[PDB]
Each structure stands twice: as C-alpha cells, then as structure tokens.
Ligand binder design. Structure first.
Ligand SMILES: NC(=O)C1=CN([C@@H]2O[C@H](COP(=O)(O)OP(=O)(O)OC[C@H]3O[C@@H](n4cnc5c(N)ncnc54)[C@H](O)[C@@H]3O)[C@@H](O)[C@H]2O)C=CC1
Ligand SMILES: Cc1ccccc1-n1c(SCc2cccc(F)c2)nc2n[nH]cc2c1=O
Ligand SMILES: [Cl-]
Ligand SMILES: [Cl-]
Ligand SMILES: [Cl-]
Ligand SMILES: [Cl-]
Ligand SMILES: [Yb+3]
Ligand SMILES: [Yb+3]
Lengths: 493, 493, 493, 493
C-alpha cells in the first residue's frame, strides 16, 4: 500500500466545459471541507442554472450529427476510455489521497478498492464500445428492417458524496462507451476528484464537450439539470427525496429518460445451517463498510433463533475492534461521516433505537473533538416497526433480529418499500435458490455480501431505483433504439 | 371480407376482476356511444379508485410467490397466449364489428388489419414466453453469478380509443409473456372490445387475477393507477398532457416504472429522385389512415422544389376520392372522428391553417348531419411556425411543404419536441442510410410508411415517449433483472 | 392414458418427395418388423442413392431464391410448425401406438412423453421462426454493416431407431424454423412414424420439397447423403462408428457442415451427503429408461464408500420390480431391445462383466420365447478397465462403483472419450457448482437425471458429438451468417 | 511511415513450449528464405510429431481445472491480451520489417495495415473476455437451468503464409479471450514473426503452456495436429486440398471440432448505374492486393455490357502503374509471390488463359532476375469454363467478363463451389439489398471491396469454409456449451 511521498496540492477547482476551465457565471465560489478535521480545503467555482446551460450547449454541440464524437469509430471511443483508465492508474496515488482527504474515506480502501474499481470499470466499459449492436429483423412483408442502437444524446448525471470517483466512472463509462455526451454534477461535498479526472479526460483527447463537469449545489445546479429542456436523460444516485424531485421535474419539463439508484434497507437471512463465521464476517462488513455509507448496507440481519445469540455475540466482538481517526493514517480502520446533516441523522436514529427499546450492545454515541465520527454501534432484539429497522441510517449502525419461521422472515425481509439487495446464508442448495428467487431485491448475495463488479448489472427493485447500471444490461439504458424499415421488391430468408 | 350475419348483441359491460364480473363499488355506470350516429350503445360499470384497488389486490395476489401464474412453466404462459389468439380468431367477425361500431373504425380495416394485428401479435408474444433468458457472468473473484429476468409485478396499463384492441394486445401480450399481472384501463370511449377479450381470457384458462380490466375515466380510474402505491409499473399510450401527469403521479407516489407513447408530428422527406407515385401513396395513407387518428400520422411532408407542384397535385387528386359514411357500410372509405373533443380540436386547427395563410387545396370543414365527420383536408405552402405544422392534429389533415436544401430540411424535420417516426423517399443508397441515421425518430421508413409489425420495437424519441414496445427489445421493459452472486471455493472458466 | 379404440392400419409406406409418394427407383422394398414379436409389420419402399438424388433436387429447388419457402414471412414458417404440432396432437393416439409397435417402446411413455416432447418441441421451434435476428455492427471506417442469419440450404438429417419421432422433430423443428429444406433418412428399423408425419406436413401446407423423407439403409441411403455434393449440411444421431464415416465422407465430397450426437458413457457421482432415495431413483431411471437405449444412459454410477452398500442394495430392489412384455399391454414396464444386433451386443457385454469379475446382483440373461428381451441387470464392484465400464452397452445394464476420493472420482468420471452428460448428487452448494464445472460433459444434472427440454441446448463434449441441438444455441447450427458491408459517405453512431 | 533505423537481427528461431525455447526433438532445422531475393534468412527448429506431442501436453496441462489460466478472472485474460497488443505496438517497426522481409509483403502495407490489424484485433478480442456469457433458461418443470460457455480446451491452429501475423492474431485472439489453450503451426515459409510474438506472450505474462508455437511442415507437424487424440479443436486457413485432409484426419482420430477458411473465387457484379471509377478502383485493389494472395481476391468481375469496354480500359490503365521490386524499398508497389510452387501455379494458369482464348490486356509473364515476381496481368472476355474463371489463381491476375442479364449473372456468380465473398456495385437501393441477399457468399460488399474488420464475422459459404471468425459470432466457435440443470422444490418466474 504505497503513498504519496509529497503533500497534496489542489489544482483543479473550476467548472469544466468544452475541455476548458471556466469561472462561475455569477463569480461565486463555495468551500470544500475535510470531514475528518472540519477545515476548509479550498474554494470551488459554484455552478448554477446559467453554467448548466453552458455545459448543455457544449454537450449538444458535441453530439451533433457530423461531429468528431458521432463520426469516430466506436473502437476509438473505447480507445479513449482505455487511455483514461491508464491515466487514472498513473495518478492513482494522488487520486486516492484526494478521495480520502475530501471524502473521509479510509485511504487503504480508496487506493485498493475505489481506485481499482474505477480503473477496472473503465476498462470494462471501453471493451463494450464497438460491441454495441443492433438487429436485423425478419419482419412480415417485403421489407428490410434493422435497428440502430444509437446514443440517446445529452445525459445529465448527478452523483453522491459517498463514492465520488466510483460513481463518476459508473456514470461516464457506460454513457461514453455508447456514444453519449454528458453533464456531470458532482456532490457539493466532493467535487475535487471529478475535476482531477476532468483534466485527464482533456489529456486523453476526448473531443471538447463530450464530458462537462459542473460542480455546485443540488437545488441549484441539480434542479437545473433535472428540469432542462435539452437534456435527453438524467441519471441519479442519492436520496429517495431527491429521486422523487428529479422524476417530477423531468415529467414537467421535457419527459427526459430517468434512472435512479436510491439506497436501501437491505436484509440478510441467516439460516441455522449457515457457516456462522463466514456469515458474521460478511454481514458485519456489509453494514460497516465506509462508515455505513453504502447504498447496499446490510441494515437488517435476521438470524435463526438457535444460532441468534452466538451470531450476536460474535458480531459485537467484531464491531469492538475498530480504531477511529484520520482516514489517511495507516492502521486507522474507521473514518468520519461525510458531514453535519448525515451526522445528525445518524445520532437521531441511534437515539430512536434506544427509546424504542432495542438492545444496545456497543457504541451509541459520537467520538472525538472534531470530525463527524460516530462510534460503531450494534442493536440486537430489533423489531420491524422500530425506526432503525425501517429507515436507511447510512451510518455505522447494525441491526440484528431473530426469526424462527422461514416463510415469515422472507415476508419480513420483503416488507419494505426498498429493494436494492439482500444476502442469504445457508449450505442448502434448494434454500439458496428458492430464497434468492423470492427476495424482492436487485442483487441477492449467497454466502457473501457486497460483491459488486463491472460485469454484473446493478440496481433496485421498488423504491430503491429503476433501471440497471453496468454489465451488458446496464448498457441498454444509455442507448435509444431506432427501427429502420426499407421497402424492397422481394425479401428472401 | 365476410361479415356478421346476425346483429351485434352487447353482452360484456362489467368490471373484470379475478375472472369475474363486478359492479362498480359506487353502483355508477357510464354511457358508451357510436361515433358515426352519436347514439348510446349501452351503459358500462364505471370503475374508480375503489375498483382499481380491488383489481390491484387481485393482481398482487396472482403475482405472489408460489401462485399458479408464478410457478407454471413459461411455455404454458405461451400456450395460454396462443390459445387466446385462437379465441380471438374464432370471434373475429364479432370483434371487428364491435370495434368498428364503438370505435368509428372502418370495418374492412378493423377486420383485415386490426384483428389480424391482434392475432399475429399475440402469437408473436406467445413465442417469447419460454425464450426470456438471463445470463451467467464471468464476474471477478471466486463467485458464481447469474441473472434472472423476472417479471416486474403488477403493471397498470392505460390505453387510448384509436386502436382499442391492438393497444390492448400490445400491452398485455408482452406483459403476460414475461409473467406479469395486469390492471388495464381502457379508453372511456371504447371499453367494449376489451371486455369481450376479458371473457376470452377467462375461457382460455388464465389464472384469476392475471388480467383485470377496469373500464372508467382518466382522472378517476387512470389517476388512481398512476398514483397507486402497489403498482410496480404503468404503461400508457395517449396525450402528452396526460403523459406528464402519469410521470409526476408516479414520482410522487412509489416511483413506479413508467413507459409512454405520446404521438408525434412525424415528417416525410421526399427527394427529387423519389419514385413519385409510391411516395404520394404512402405519404397519403400515412396521414389519412383511420381519419388521421394515428400516433405516427405523417403530418409534415417536405418535398424537393422541383417535384413539389406535382407532388401536391397528385396528393389532392388522391384525397378527393373518399366516401364518408357509416364505417360498417361496404365501400365507405372514411369514418367519423372519435368524439366531440377531437372533433372540435381538428376544426379549430383547420381554422388556424386558413388564418395563418396556408393554402387550402381541398376539404376544410365538417360533413353530414350526425357523426363527428371532418372532410379530408389538404394544406400546401405550409410553413414551420404555423400551428398545423407544429401541433398534432389527429384528424384527416395533411400538410405539404417545400424544401430545396437537404441539410436544412433534416434540421426542419428534427425541429420538434416530438420524434415518433419519419419517412424518407429516395432511390439513392447513401441518402437512404445517412438521412435515416440523422433523423431523430424511433422508426424511420424508407420508400414506405406506416409499416409496423410485431417483430420490430416501436416507440419515440424525445417527447414522443420513452421505452420500446414489441420486438425483442420491447420485452426488456416488462422484466426486472436480479443478479444472484454465490460465493464459491474456486471458479474455473 | 387413453388408447386407440380401433386396430392400427398402416397406410404410409412410400418415399416422400415434393409432397408426393414415390416408389423406389429400383422398385425394391424392405421389411419392417415389430421387436416384441419378431413379425413383419409391412414392406416399405427402399430408398437408395438415386432416390436421395431426387429428394436433394426437390429440396434444392424449394430453397431457391424467390420460392415460396424463401419469400414467405418468417412468422408463417412458424405458423406452419405450430399447425404441424396441432396435427400431431390430433393423431397422438395413432402415432404413439405406431411408435410403440414399431419401436418396441412402452406405450405409456410413447404417449405421455415421446408424443408430448414432439408436440412441445415443435411449438418451441415455431416460436423462434421470426425471432432469428442478425446484427448491425459499428465496424471501423465509413460503412454500414449488418448480418443476415440465413438458412444454410439443403440439410441431410440421419436419425436413429431409439426415439424415431422425437429425433425427427429435433432435427426438422430447428431446420425448418430457420428456413432450411431437409432430406430425412429415418432408421431402417423405424421408418413408419416419420412417414405418417410426412402426411401431416403435406396436410399442414408446407411447400412441396421443404421436407423430403427417404426411408432406407445406412450404407446406401445414409452414405449417399453424407457424400452428396449438393447437400449443405448433414446432422446425425447414432453410433460413433458411423459418425466417423459421415465426417470423412463429408470431408472428401463437398466439405458440408457436420453435426453429430453419438451417445455416451455418462457418469453419476453420488456424495455421502446426497438424498439417497432421490439419487437411487434418478440414477436407476437414468440407466434403464427405454431398455437402456438412451444416449444419456447413466452407465457408470460412482457412490461414496460410506453409503455404497446401501446404494447398491436399494438399486437392486428397484431393478427387481420390472414386468417384461408387450410394450402395448398396460402394466408392462419393460419392452424388448430394438433388434438382433443390439441384442447380441448387450448379451456379449453382460458376458464380459461376468468374466471380468464384476459382481452380478440381478438379471444377466435373456427372457422369453420371442422378442429381443434382456433381463434388467445390475453389476456392483465394477472397475474402470472392465468392458462394461468403458463401452456403451445401450441395454438395461447398470454399473455401480465405489469411490472415497473426490478428486479421484472426477478424474475417473472424465476419463473417457465420451462426454454427453453427467449427474451429481449432493446437498452442498459449493460441491454442486465446482463438480459440475469440472465434469467434461454437455449436460450436467444436479440431484436429478435425464431432464431434457426444448429450452436447453443439448449435445456432447469430446467424442459424444459436436454442436448443440435445441435451445437458443441450437438454432445457430441451422443458420449461415452473411456479413453485408455498404460504403457510405459518413457514418454516425 | 517510419522505418527501423537499424538492421533487422533475427533472434527467435526455436520451438516455443511452456514459455521456453526448445530444440527440435530430432535436432533438425529447416531454412527460411526471403521471397524477393531467394536467399536464406536463417535456420529454424523443425517441429514434427514428437514436438507437437510436447506442445499438446503443455497446453493440456495449462487447461487443467484449477490452473492459473482456468481460475484467473476473465477480465485478466483480457488484460493480458491488451498488454500483448501494446507490446506488438511497441515492436511495430521491427515486426513489420520482419513480416515484409520474410513474407514478400510491401512494407507500407505491413506497417500501416497488417500491424494495425493485429493490434486492433487483439484489442477487440481483449474486450470480449469478460463479456462471454451463458444463459439462465425457463425450462419446463421444477428445475434451475443455466449454461456455461466454457472454453473447448486445446486448440490446434494451422496458419498460412500470406498474412502470417494477422492470421496468428485472428486465431489466438478469440481462442485466448474465451480461455482456450493453443498449439500454433505457422506456415513453413513464414515462422519468424510468430516466434517474435511468442517472446512477447512470455513478456506479457501469459501462464506457461497457454500459447505454444511449433514451426514446421504441413504433412509433418500439421498432420500431427489434425490427427491428434488430445486436441479438442483444429482451426485452419489455407488450401481446399489440405482442408479436406484436416477434416478427414479429424474424423478418423478423435472427432475434434474443425473450422476452415479455404479461399475463393469471389465475384463482383457491376451494374450500369454504378459509380464507375469507384467500382474500378475497389475491384482493382480487390484482386491485386498483396500480389493477389488474398483469400477474398475479386477474381471474377462481371460488368454490364454498356459500360464493359470503359470498365476494362480503366482497369488496364490502373494495372499498368505498378513498380515491382523489393517490398522494403519505398515507392515499390508490388512485391514477389511467396515461393516457387505459387509462382509456377500462377504462370501455368496465365498460360491457360492465353490458350483458352481469353484476351490479354497487359502483363502475362514473369519479371526480374530473382524473386518470384509475376507481372500484373489483366484478362478481358473471359468465359465461365476457362480455368482462370474457375480456379483460385492467388496471383496478380484479374479476370473481366461481360453480362447483360441480371438473373443470369447472379447465377453465374453463384455457380462455383466457392463462396467466401462478393461485391455489388450499384446506386439502387433495391438492387443492393436483393442482389446481396441472393449471392451465396459469406461477406458481400456494396460499392466497396476488401473491407474487413474485427467487429464483423468472417468466413465462407460452401467449399470456402465453415464457421466464422471474429465479431461476436466468431467467439461462439471457441466455446463449448454446458447445460446445468438443478432439481428444485419449486420454481418461480
Ligand atoms: N446416440 C444415440 O442416441 C444412439 C446411439 N447408438 C449407438 O450405436 C450403436 C450401434 O447401433 P446402430 O443401430 O448400428 O446405429 P447406427 O449409427 O448405425 O444407425 C443410426 C442411423 O445411422 C444410419 N447409418 C448406418 N450406417 C450408415 C452409413 N454408412 N452412412 C450413413 N448412415 C448410416 C442408420 O441407417 C440409422 O439411420 C448402438 O449400440 C448405440 O451404442 C445407436 C442409435 C442411437
Ligand atoms: C426428457 C424427458 C421428458 C419427459 C419424460 C421423461 C424424460 N426422460 C428421458 S428422455 C430421453 C431422451 C430422449 C431423446 C433425446 C435424449 F437426448 C434423451 N430420459 C431419461 N433417462 N432417465 C430419466 C429420464 C427422463 O425422465
Ligand atoms: Cl443480465
Ligand atoms: Cl433491437
Ligand atoms: Cl446457451
Ligand atoms: Cl452476427
Ligand atoms: Yb429367439
Ligand atoms: Yb529464377
């Protein structure tokens, strides 16, 4: 695990449009902070409506018929993506450090996992570029019919603060491989890595206007994207609240295509026959990963009565090993929460668990003199109407619950408007297959948790989102199908 | 072209839920009229919120894990669809007559085309049932990963009055083949054929609650579907206005998946080298078909100057041959418009064409003492800011316009928030391919128009809709993908 | 289980070419016998070279560009297949009776399973007809590129005597759905059902020459197909010996495409943790089905030492319940072998098991005064170099063997030039996945055996064959891909 | 067009097995010559049976379950292929020079086209590695069924001398992306570039035994591959003669999968309405490219009478511009033929054209004092029974013929046992589509010729080969499908 052997100097702090750096139209700038110390890192140009309009004009223009981005070989789109990946690999130390410092993200994860995932996902998406194919179709009558799987056009992409880089690449990888142009709104908390990557998009040689990045706020820059009359599609990861707002803004404006990923309250079902240690470990990592700030956090763990006490005891043991501190310092195993709002939300919900009569096993309060740190907390005997069983906490707060009836627990597991993911732990083949089939969730893990890869489509059932990202299937959501039907004298099979 | 040799007796006039006929909860009924005579045909139970709630409970229950519809072979879903098609083929005379009488639809088309399309589309969709497949995926790490392409769940389906039967089958065919359950809201103008088909769904042996049909009004029964918290997906064909309302209702309620088809202002581009007669004929049929009441109506026809006068003259000649009258009487070649609202809208827009200084070639007013008949009308010298060039008329009103610059006409053709379809007429290969690629439209026809088949996906660019119906691609919009990832000791390729 | 309530009258005994019945060119006829009584059933026209030449001319002519079979809608090919299926369903009693009487096949299976499989497979294949699609491809440079998945052309299809009808439909279903024409050579033992089906192909309305059926002998009619210079492809199921001859004949003549299915020596691996009764039952059915005359017969069963004695004891118990007799008489549970050659081969191999020092648990000799009956026989303590462990017996002869080392048994299971299928019986997920991945076999069943369906591709590893039949994947082997690449002024994505 | 600024030193001259250099078992070596000067370049270890056996043992061992090549991520296979491509890009000057010197291949083409194609094809194939997916299948009954698209195993790959490097990459790219191991037999004329690439496979880090390269002769090393009992599949490009031998050897030995590409006698059809200059240019390049030594050479050009004389005159003009000489010297536009045998074959066929009464327009004899040079030669008034109209010449010998009947010329174009490719030149859409549909050829170009790319599948109809290379479709021929069917308590859709 190597490190930057030189202090991080922040350089890229402007709005990126047509491969150049722009001040905000208003002249305004906003602060960006380090969540571990609560100190300002730098000022960044604040994008708003007017800036979004500039980015959209640039992206429209880059999408025009006859432009370099439309006429270049598909394989050359792929080539540019593979080059960007190599650039990101080149600046990996730097990027991982920036991610950690701005994101409150453990550096060893930032380096070994976030940066790796970026690189690998870009490479994956690069490979798809010239393998996006339409069809020839044996339509009734004397016609030749084919389809083109075209890019959609200008895609507005709104990204959260929990995985700034991964989410950037998850959005732009697919969009660009299929031949779209994009207007990206990073989280106001975490603009910095996206702008470094913007420099690399320029260095890689993407045509100007193919990628535009407008840092700024949600009700300002975000609302302007969702309501924009010349944006063909918006993709979003974040809160359910905002998801509703994007969808409605889109309905009122130009009926743009919308896709959403909106977090979860994901359940694990642990059967008596499960490898217990394996189940405890994955379930534990599944809820605590990145300070609980994962859409897929395993925030309800149902364990069969006969092993419930053991499961609880081992889980507490495991949660009691963390060292809180600066995400940059080696051996530190838990960073802060992203900001005040998330922090207050977590403490408030922890308070509800106590009041509602859940059993506190460890943690339960804040930590330190600065940083938005929260002690890793475990509740046992949680019941299904408690706030902590129902609401996404997005903090290091694990819920453990008992079942003895299998039909009953599947129904409890499904009894949520969420449905991002789930976990099933058992050694029995039939139960692995039938439970996973019956769970209403977009990804179901068996005897593992949190395994996510570029090859697999990813997204929600129900109010956890719509559409899929990544995998072959995800690519469909960045194409628009056109059917072309030509009259002919006579067809032959 | 055979006919019913017995007067049509209307029989099915109730709400269809769990394979039984129900009165409205309120006890209310509404009238259904014949558009050709303006006389009431019968009374039909008026579904509203409460009735939609009953249908949704039935459809949820039929979708439950372990139910007959979830556990039966995929091939048996297909078998039921092929059986329904045979039933519809059995009652073809009757259905075509009901469609014509209630829909104001020419009987020869109703029989030879609408009924045929229903039958053929059901058969197409039946064949897909056991060929809906997921994937096995060579994910990073030691895991086995597969996807299931599951049904979504309860699908609310809102249908217009222009093609009552075709639209019913376009909705239920795909939905059912993939294994969904459905709640169908037919157009208040045209409930009758859908309820006959409901009797046939029962006779075919679909499990109760797989198909439910709730006749009723849009702001009542329709709004209840769009806003319903236990409906997983709504599909809609109709007005842009309502499309916006569905999308926003869905955003506010449970973020249900939405797909929309919303009409158009579809352009044809006719080049000097075109087969002129062929172009005039298809363009003519492309705008006049079913009294102009087609989403794909070719409502802007751009013709190269050097053949523009000829194109106009032949088009007028062609439009002057129609015989208006009862859609049931043989030799009648133009029925009425569906109702008062559409009628007033058409006359109003015709009036705007006159006032705005378009050239009237023929028609321009109403016809007859009853029925909502409108004379087939042609405007030449139409310009791009005239209301008749911009707004979907949905009446027998053809617009013809001149161009001489090809780059310019592609831009005029694309300069619309619509994008359902287009037509290109030329003998030059390069122009056929490059123009069709550059047109922003979901289907582009070359040297033909209005060719639509079960094998081809169908839908809009831009504000003409989202998602695709039919073809392989359409089937994707009725599945929800679940990724299942199993930990294994060691994988091998 | 209903029966024909009328004696079977044989009617169709001629060569079928261009939808008409032809005498053999030579005037010769050959006998067809009932394997249960050894009595001649009828005489059938003997096809030879000259007759095959007539069928190939007919099939070539039906495949010509512009013919009805090439120009008809794909959906109409499908329609004809679905109609044939309905006809076969209509004559199911008759066909099942003919199959049983000529094939020595238990009537209850003939009716409930062979006839059902025919019908269901035809329906499956009918659904694919208009869903065979090519691609549009984003090739480098300014070109439009698409592929057509055309039919290959004239396909020669050589069928065995064990599943005459199923194999006929497995060959013609796919071939016809994709739009090929065919020349079918049924087994000399079992021409009769194929010719009844030929009458039904005519009644369904297939264009003449689309299906031609030439009954006759292998070195005569078969060799003429394999060596024919105007046959584009030969498909074959049967012996390894003949498979080699087909492939070499094809190499010397016109390099026609070849696909082969050639039987097996398929292994089951039964782990200590297996549901024992379930494993014994499926393994038992897996070897005894149709008098052992299945390509997939589970002819080596490796059982973990600790349950080996139990497994053996229960298996013997099960094998001792059969009633031998006329396949037509209800309650009869084992018919005769097809003929003298197979009979002698089975007895000879049984003799080798005794001599080589395998343990005889039951059976071991012939039965009855007529018919080619063989007692159901079980060997335990079989070892890997015994003839009965190595050679396909194709008789009711079950081999049971012991293992204790799992790595070792996978290697023993794979140590064969065959590889059609295998079975794994365990309750452990990891073992189910890793064993099945490691077995070199085309289909691997887990906790079952002999489950074969139209939706699944089917074929061999190694010397058990090449290519796949059925499923989506099988359809590929009946298409020829043509790439069409058009120069264009400028492409756009 | 840069050059090596340093004389080419030959270094790699051994047999490559398990990532190490081996002498021939026999100790024998054979000469390798430069076709332009007829001088020996070096000696190379002569592989034979015994050496092929060593390579096959290495490749089997590398394919074993649990080996690094089987267990590594698919994405990592892809990573290794992309790395090899970068290495080849690194040594591009060197490789292009080696190709030109050993292959008699124009250096500017070697560099700008062969080397480019290698690089681009490797990159294409790298992208497929982790996108090779199987299916989950909704089989009848209570089962879970999936397919794995596994690698086949050990693939023997026999390569010709016309495109040594391109053919190497066309074989290994796909094979390796899918996860096979390979035993490559380069052409005895042209081993040298393949062994340089072998050094790069080692430097890239492929596991030992994944790629093995055995230089040597056809009846020795080649026959040993085709007849080898532990080689799962052989792929071959070359003569029809040898193709027959491979197929038959495979039939007799272990029934290994075979695919073949075997050259052609590819026709162009030029209609009166064609862009004449464009047609003359592409047709000209289509026959003369690389001294006529292309499988796809446009060796029969049918031109409509009314433009035939013009077409001929312009074609002669074009053929008369070549400068023959050392393929390394800039401005040289035609190299020698590969060797004596090809040279004699070309002269002999030229002699037949004269004798049979074809009209000689230019060329007709050899050139120079050394090298196997042949003057670029054009025949007009060629007729369909002349040897030069029927036999693949594989020399710079163009045939031009007249037609006036379109139905007739399609039949003449198809009247050949070949079918690799064809060209159609016209401005009419209908004719482009209907002619290309009617031509019996694997690739059909419209208004171009010789456009071949990694994205498009490539191969023959009829005796021009079987199976396809490259594109999505080509990848199928390097997988073996296994169906896995698991018994379950109850399935749900
Ligand atoms: N894969 C399977 O399901 C089958 C496997 N077999 C195996 O083959 C063994 C021998 O049985 P046979 O009946 O002799 O099978 P076989 O392979 O000779 O007969 C099957 C078909 O091939 C034809 N045939 C025979 N000689 C031919 C030739 N020279 N050219 C072209 N076609 C020819 C036959 O006329 C028949 O239509 C069996 O004991 C069994 O192990 C036999 C039948 C089916
Ligand atoms: C597949 C099936 C459907 C319906 C009823 C029974 C079966 N079936 C069979 S069928 C054997 C067969 C028939 C044709 C081709 C083949 F490759 C194999 N073979 C079997 N062997 N052992 C159990 C079997 C079975 O259940
Ligand atoms: Cl998928
Ligand atoms: Cl498509
Ligand atoms: Cl498959
Ligand atoms: Cl393809
Ligand atoms: Yb006897
Ligand atoms: Yb010489």
């Amino acid at each position: 695990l190597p490190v930057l052997l030189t202090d991080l100097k922040i350089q890229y702090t402007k709005i990126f449009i047509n491969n150049e750096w722009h001040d905000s139209v208003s002249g305004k700038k906003f602060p960006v902070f380090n969540p571990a110390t609560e100190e300002e890192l730098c000022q960044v140009e604040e994008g708003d409506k007017e800036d979004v309009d500039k980015a959209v004009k640039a992206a429209r223009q880059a999408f025009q018929i006859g432009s370099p981005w439309r006429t270049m070989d598909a394989s050359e789109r792929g080539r540019l993506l593979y080059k960007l990946a190599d650039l990101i690999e080149r600046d990996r130390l730097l990027l991982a450090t920036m991610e950690s410092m701005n994101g409150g993200k453990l550096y060893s994860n930032a380096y070994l996992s976030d940066l790796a995932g970026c690189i690998k996902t870009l490479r994956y998406c690069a490979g798809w570029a010239d393998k996006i194919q339409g069809r020839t179709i044996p339509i009734d009558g004397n016609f030749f019919t084919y389809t083109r799987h075209e890019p959609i056009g200008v895609c507005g992409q709104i990204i959260p603060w929990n995985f700034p880089l991964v989410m950037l690449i998850w959005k732009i990888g697919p969009a660009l491989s299929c031949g779209n142009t994009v207007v990206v709104k990073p989280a106001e908390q975490t603009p910095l890595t996206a702008l470094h990557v913007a420099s690399l998009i320029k260095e890689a040689g993407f045509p100007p206007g193919v990628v535009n990045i407008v840092p700024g706020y949600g009700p300002t820059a975000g609302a302007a994207i969702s309501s924009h009359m010349d944006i063909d599609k918006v993709a979003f990861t974040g809160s359910t609240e905002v998801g509703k707002l994007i969808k409605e803004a889109a309905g009122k404006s130009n009926l743009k295509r919308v896709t959403l990923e909106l977090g979860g309250k994901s359940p694990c079902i642990v059967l008596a026959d499960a490898d217990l240690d394996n189940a405890v470990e994955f379930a534990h990592h599944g809820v605590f990963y990145h300070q609980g700030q994962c859409c897929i956090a395993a925030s309800r763990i149902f364990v069969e009565e006969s092993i419930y006490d053991e499961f609880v005891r081992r889980s507490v043991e495991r949660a009691k090993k963390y060292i809180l501190g600066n995400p940059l310092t080696p051996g530190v195993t838990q960073g802060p929460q992203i900001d005040k709002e998330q922090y207050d939300k977590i403490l408030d919900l922890i308070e509800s668990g106590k009041k509602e009569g859940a059993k506190l096993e460890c943690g339960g309060g804040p930590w330190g003199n600065k940083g938005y740190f929260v002690q890793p907390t475990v509740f046992s005997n949680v019941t299904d109407e408690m706030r902590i069983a129902k609401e996404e906490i997005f903090g290091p707060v694990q819920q453990i619950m008992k079942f003895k009836s299998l039909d009953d627990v599947i129904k409890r597991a499904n009894n949520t408007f969420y449905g991002l993911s789930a976990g099933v732990f058992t050694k029995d083949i039939d139960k692995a297959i039938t439970i996973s089939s019956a769970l209403q969730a977009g990804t179901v893990w068996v005897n593992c948790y949190g395994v996510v890869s570029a090859q697999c489509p990813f997204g929600g059932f129900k109010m956890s989102g719509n559409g899929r990202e990544l995998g072959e299937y995800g690519f469909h959501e960045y194409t628009e199908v056109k059917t072309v039907t030509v009259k002919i004298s006579q067809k032959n099979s």
